[PDB]
From a paper:
The [name] domain comprises 100–130 amine acids and is often present in chromatin-associated proteins. Our structures revealed that the overall fold of the [name] domain consists of three motifs: a canonical β-barrel core, an insertion motif between the second and third β-strands and a C-terminal α-helix bundle. The canonical β-barrel core harbors an aromatic cage constructed by three aromatic residues, which is a signature feature of the Tudor domain “Royal family”. Taken together, similar to other members in the ‘Royal family’, [name] domain also exhibits methyllysine histone binding ability.
DNMT3A and DNMT3B are de novo DNA methyltransferases and the loss-of-function mutations in human DNMT3B causes a developmental defect characterized by hypomethylation of pericentromeric repeats and are implicated in ICF (immunodeficiency, centromeric instability, facial anomalies) syndrome. DNMT3A had been shown to bind histone H3K36me3, but we were not able to obtain its cocrystals with H3K36me3, Nevertheless, we found a bis-tris buffer molecule in both the DNMT3A and DNMT3B structures. The bis-tris molecule resides in the conserved aromatic cage of the [name] domains. The bis-tris molecule is bound to DNMT3A and DNMT3B in slightly different conformations. The bis-tris molecule in complex with the [name] domain of DNMT3A or DNMT3B provides a clue for designing small molecules targeting their histone binding domain.
Residue numbers in the entry: 215 to 318, 326 to 351
């Protein structure tokens, strides 16, 4: 009954997570058992950040589906930080495999165009965990 608090987001979900002083960052919702920490408080979820693999306990109100991409993608942070560019690659690679998508900085370009364009042809349904 982990995360049975009435709030959104379950294990395996791709999300944007917001920490104070940082841009919205891509992550995956994980079970507390993967963290080596403790059970999350009601209303909170454990997430693992793409690019650095670290764990954080984040309020479900500070998470949004990764699928709301153009809405949370930060162009200024993308241009400024190589760590954000690397996080985008790992998050969009996970999204690509889940959606059954195939592509023909250079690797990132068509993945970013696919994400910004609404993850066509599956849309956001293709990012759901199996």
């Amino acid at each position: 009954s982990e995360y049975q608090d009435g709030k959104e987001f379950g294990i395996g979900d791709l999300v944007w997570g917001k920490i104070k002083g940082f841009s919205w960052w891509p992550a995956m919702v994980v079970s507390w058992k993967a963290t080596s920490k403790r059970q999350a408080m009601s209303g909170m979820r454990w997430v693992q950040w793409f690019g650095d693999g670290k764990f954080s306990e984040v309020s479900a109100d500070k998470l949004v589906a990764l699928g709301l991409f153009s809405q949370h993608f930060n162009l200024a942070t993308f241009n400024k930080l190589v760590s954000y560019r690397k996080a985008m690659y790992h998050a969009l690679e996970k999204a690509r495999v889940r959606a059954g998508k195939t592509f023909p900085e250079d690797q990132l370009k068509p993945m970013l165009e696919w994400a910004h364009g609404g993850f066509k042809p599956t849309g956001i349904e293709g990012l759901k965990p199996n």
